[PDB]
Amino acid sequence: NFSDYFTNKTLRIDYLFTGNADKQSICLDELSELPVWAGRRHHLSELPLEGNGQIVMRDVASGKVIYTTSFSSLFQEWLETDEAKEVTKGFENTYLLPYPIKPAEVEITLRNNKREVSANLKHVVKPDDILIHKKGLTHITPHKYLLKSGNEEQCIDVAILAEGYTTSEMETFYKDAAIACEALFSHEPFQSMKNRFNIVAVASPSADSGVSAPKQGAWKHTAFGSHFDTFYSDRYLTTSRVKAINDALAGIPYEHIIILANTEQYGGGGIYNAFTLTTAHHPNFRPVVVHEFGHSFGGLADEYFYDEDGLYPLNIEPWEQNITTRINFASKWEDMLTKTTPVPTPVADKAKYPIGVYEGGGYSAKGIYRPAFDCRMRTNEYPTFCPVCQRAIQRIIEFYTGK
């Protein structure tokens, strides 16, 4: 089932997502080959989560689905900003697929907030195409394994990258990476499932120490050009240099990316099957890196909300597992409630019901509900993922490594 269509190599595909609030398009940027396939070898035609976008690989000769993955993107978030009503922008996006033996047809799809198709691209990949850029053979970024439970075929490979660390600050980076690892494996279900993971710390160098602070006019030369003030949101620390992120990892087996930023300023970002980015020297580093990994690895939604008032239409059940609009609550955590739990669960009864249907979630105070009064996905001070987030993360771990 894996050996019938694939070789133990990776087909890396770089795309450009372009558009504005009115129309979106996808175009191919570049095809590359990586030396090993670090992804799954089972459930090849199934998705663990829908994502905001999907990739389907089909065998050209038979037309059969041979691989599928899903994700979210910085582009799809940008579409929800005021700037997307005024200008057309382009964004880099990279996806890792198993390398096919015979020609394969790749189809990439983007969906809107109504979970409808908003952009699509279908293209044929010929495995002997001379313009498939061979990567990860030489000048592999210095790295060290923090944790090695097994080979890349049996464990989940997580790569931790250095952002804003010069070559002389790498001992601080490796210490920071060890702290992220300790924070992650102190949370269930990661704690009990630690032997399912490989953690590699990748010493990707920056010319400058620290990160770009656009609001203060302090731009720096760094490995991935990360910056605060993403979408003019002060604490939103992201990078749109997705090709540079993946080029730094070429030759190192990886499935998931965590980026550590060498700064004391508060900030971070996390996007499903894209990457996590976080401050390493702010005191809230430990809950923040785990919260962002909840997004990037877990595909979890934010459970916090604001008082003031469109990202989750109330007529649509979200695909995210830890929030509901009560359209299709049976597909969520209804099976985890007691027979007498009130729906919605009044805030006055929070102590009576550790698991409930609490109004407020996915940035809205009304119409969106979360599974517990508090969670790692709602606040930094709360010590754990709620029971529903824990089940959702365990399902992801088991999808990639078995029951």
Interface ranges with Zn ion (CB under 5 A): 302, 322, 375, 377, 386, 389
Residue 27 or 117: the one with the smaller Cβ distance to a copy of itself is 27
Residue 29 or 398: the one with the smaller Cβ distance to a copy of itself is 29
Rg (CA), the chain: 21
| Subset of residues 136 to 155 that bind a copy of itself, contact rule: CB under 8 A | 137-139
Amino acid (one-letter) located at 221 = H
Q: Tell me how far, at minimum, the Cβ of 378 lies from Zn ion, in Å.
A: 7
The annotation status of 181 as a binding-site residue, yes or no, is: no
Task: For residues 231 and 99, give the distance between their C-alpha atoms in angstroms, rounded to a whole number.
Answer: 36
Residue 310 or 381: the one with the smaller Cβ distance to Cl ion is 310
Nearest to 209 by CA among 223, 191, 196, 195: 223
H-helix or E-strand containing 173?
Answer: helix 170-184
Q: Are 371 and 390 in contact (CB under 8 A)?
A: no
Contact string 119-138 vs a copy of itself (x = CB under 8 A):
--x-xx-----xx-xxx-xx
329's contact among Na ion, Cl ion, Zn ion, none, with CB below 5 to 8 A by partner kind, is: Cl ion
Residue 206 or 296: the one with the smaller Cβ distance to Zn ion is 296
In the three-class reduction of DSSP (H, G, I as helix; E, B as strand; rest coil), residue 183 is classed as helix
Contacts (Cβ under 8 Å, ≥6 apart) of 320: 49, 299, 300, 301, 362
Instruction: Name the DSSP letter for residue 350.
Output: T
Number of residues in contact with a copy of itself under rule CB under 8 A: 35
The annotation status of 302 as a binding-site residue, yes or no, is: yes
Number of residues in contact with Na ion under rule CB under 5 A: 3
Rule CB under 5 A: say whether 266 interacts with Cl ion: no
**Contact with Na ion (CB under 5 A) among 26, 36, 38, 242:** 38
H-helix or E-strand containing 245?
Answer: helix 242-249
The annotation status of 50 as a binding-site residue, yes or no, is: no
Rule CB under 5 A: say whether 10 interacts with Na ion: no
389's contact among a copy of itself, Zn ion, Cl ion, none, with CB below 5 to 8 A by partner kind, is: Zn ion
Rule CB under 5 A: say whether 152 interacts with Na ion: yes
**Contact with a copy of itself (CB under 8 A) among 217, 307, 308, 339:** 217
Residue 108 or 375: the one with the smaller Cβ distance to Zn ion is 375
18's contact among Na ion, Cl ion, Zn ion, none, with CB below 5 to 8 A by partner kind, is: none
**Contact with a copy of itself (CB under 8 A) among 3, 22, 87, 403:** 87
The reply to whether omega before 287 is within 30° of 0 (cis) is: no
- Phi, then psi, of 14 in degrees rounded to 5: -100, 125
Side-chain half-sphere CA neighbours of 95 within 13 A: 25
Task: For residues 333 and 321, give the distance between their C-alpha atoms in angstroms, rounded to a whole number.
Answer: 8
| Subset of residues 110 to 139 that bind Cl ion, contact rule: CB under 5 A | 112-113
The annotation status of 281 as a binding-site residue, yes or no, is: no
User: Exposed/middle/buried for 50, CB within 10 Å: 0-12, 13-18, 19+?
Assistant: middle
Q: Tell me how far, at minimum, the Cβ of 222 lies from a copy of itself, in Å.
A: 11
Task: For residues 156 and 400, give the distance between their C-alpha atoms in angstroms, rounded to a whole number.
Answer: 7
Task: For residues 155 and 152, give the distance between their C-alpha atoms in angstroms, rounded to a whole number.
Answer: 6
Task: For residues 206 and 219, give the distance between their C-alpha atoms in angstroms, rounded to a whole number.
Answer: 13
In the three-class reduction of DSSP (H, G, I as helix; E, B as strand; rest coil), residue 109 is classed as strand
Q: Tell me how far, at minimum, the Cβ of 153 lies from Na ion, in Å.
A: 6
Q: Are 163 and 224 in contact (CB under 8 A)?
A: yes
- Phi, then psi, of 261 in degrees rounded to 5: -100, 130
Rule CB under 8 A: say whether 19 interacts with a copy of itself: yes
Rule CB under 5 A: say whether 329 interacts with Cl ion: yes
As a whole number of Å, the end-to-end CA separation of the chain is 19
| Subset of residues 276 to 295 that bind Na ion, contact rule: CB under 5 A | none
The annotation status of 27 as a binding-site residue, yes or no, is: no
| Subset of residues 331 to 360 that bind Na ion, contact rule: CB under 5 A | none
Length of the chain: 403
Q: Are 369 and 326 in contact (CB under 8 A)?
A: yes
* Chain positions contacting a copy of itself, by CB under 8 A: 16, 18-19, 25-29, 86-90, 121, 123-124, 130-131, 133-135, 137-139, 207-208, 212, 214-215, 217, 219, 221, 227, 229, 232
Binding interface with Na ion (CB under 5 A): 38, 152, 157
Q: Which residues are annotated as a binding site?
A: 291-292, 295, 302-303, 375, 386, 389
* Annotation: binding site for Zn(2+): 291-292, 295, 302-303, 375, 386, 389
Which residues would be at the binding site for Cl ion (CB under 5 A)? 112-113, 263-264, 329-330
